[PDB]
Write an enzyme that holds these catalytic residues in place. Structure first.
Site, PDB file in Angstrom:
ATOM      1  N   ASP A  57       0.766  -1.248   0.000  1.00 45.45           N
ATOM      2  CA  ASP A  57       0.000   0.000   0.000  1.00 45.45           C
ATOM      3  C   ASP A  57       0.798   1.301   0.000  1.00 45.45           C
ATOM      4  OD1 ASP A  57      -2.787  -1.167   0.117  1.00 45.45           O
ATOM      5  OD2 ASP A  57      -1.983  -2.029   1.961  1.00 45.45           O
ATOM      6  N   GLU A  67       1.357  -1.604   4.879  1.00 42.53           N
ATOM      7  CA  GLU A  67       0.149  -2.325   4.505  1.00 42.53           C
ATOM      8  C   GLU A  67      -0.913  -1.457   5.172  1.00 42.53           C
ATOM      9  OE1 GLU A  67      -1.598  -5.454   3.556  1.00 42.53           O
ATOM     10  OE2 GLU A  67      -0.270  -4.939   1.892  1.00 42.53           O
ATOM     11  N   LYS A  69      -5.050  -1.272   6.216  1.00 41.94           N
ATOM     12  CA  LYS A  69      -6.401  -1.820   6.357  1.00 41.94           C
ATOM     13  C   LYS A  69      -7.348  -0.766   6.910  1.00 41.94           C
ATOM     14  CE  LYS A  69      -5.461  -5.082   4.388  1.00 41.94           C
ATOM     15  NZ  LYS A  69      -5.724  -6.527   4.557  1.00 41.94           N
TER      16      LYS A  69
HETATM   17 MG   LIG Z   1      -2.982  -4.833   1.689  1.00 39.45          MG
END
Ligand SMILES: [Mg+2]
Ligand SMILES: [Mg+2]
Lengths: 156, 156
Positions: A57, A67, A69
């Site tokens: 990301d 990453e 979320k």
């Molecule tokens: Mg991801």
């Protein structure tokens, strides 16, 4: 001339401004893929979004990749991870910390950060499984918000 | 320095106020499926968005249902219709007037209205093709922006 159209005239100047700001940070349409949302975390966290498809990301200035979320505490209670999870995926997720964003609506309420070790409990498990079930993938295992509030660092 | 964040906090109340406005008009998330765009269309136009079913997209206070179509003049140049076009779908269509929303970015640029008689030209052409093709569903035929402008009543 009516109540709402006056509200659109009144509010629109700022909306166009919010969109301009969103372009500068790499987001074409705030009204599309939660662009209006992804931006808050970016601005709130000084991060930068990576194009590509759906692999790694964001990344900071130091180059450390992240990453990321997101969850709507009004609707869900666990974060999605990957519908097709195997040992290759898990092998990648265990190298970068994850940024967890908690929204209540379109508004951000909090942001935590789990280090690679803080999700280890989930990696070693989802992996020991991939084997037990017989090399079978896991369908989007979810990490509980409770888990992230107790293990990660609160950035916002 | 925190240049852009301070800005975000400055714009947010209007963003939130904009989101509340959308909810009143049945749009749960402005940063989803063009939530912030369809709103411009609903407030300016005064139409009411019809739930998933009911075929037609909107209605006015008089109970006149409409077919609402949109495009980003920056990207495409022709409004889509239906991926499985057929005489039955076309029958659905001849019944109502169409509203044509032309967006340029996150902002409306113009809005036009066509009476069935104005799309009569395209319906027949399709019906005929559905047949001469041995009963085959025409894959999402489109209507050129140039047409809707030449033949439609500009409401915005
Ligand atoms: Mg991801
Ligand atoms: Mg259709």
């Amino acid at each position: 001339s009516h109540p709402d159209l006056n509200k659109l005239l009144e509010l629109w100047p700022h909306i166009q401004e919010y969109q301009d700001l969103a372009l500068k940070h790499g987001i074409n349409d705030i009204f599309q893929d939660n662009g209006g949302k992804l931006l808050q975390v970016l601005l709130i966290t000084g991060l930068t979004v990576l194009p590509g498809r759906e692999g790694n990301d964001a990344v900071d200035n130091a180059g450390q990749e992240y990453e990321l979320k997101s969850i709507n505490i009004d609707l869900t209670k666990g974060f999605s991870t990957h519908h097709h999870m195997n040992p290759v995926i898990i092998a990648k997720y265990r190298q970068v910390p994850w940024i967890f964003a908690i929204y209540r609506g379109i508004a951000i309420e909090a942001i935590y950060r789990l280090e690679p070790k803080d999700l280890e409990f989930y990696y070693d498990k989802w992996e020991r499984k991939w084997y037990s079930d017989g090399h079978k993938d896991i369908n989007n295992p979810k990490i509980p918000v409770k888990y992230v509030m107790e293990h990660g660092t609160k950035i916002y």
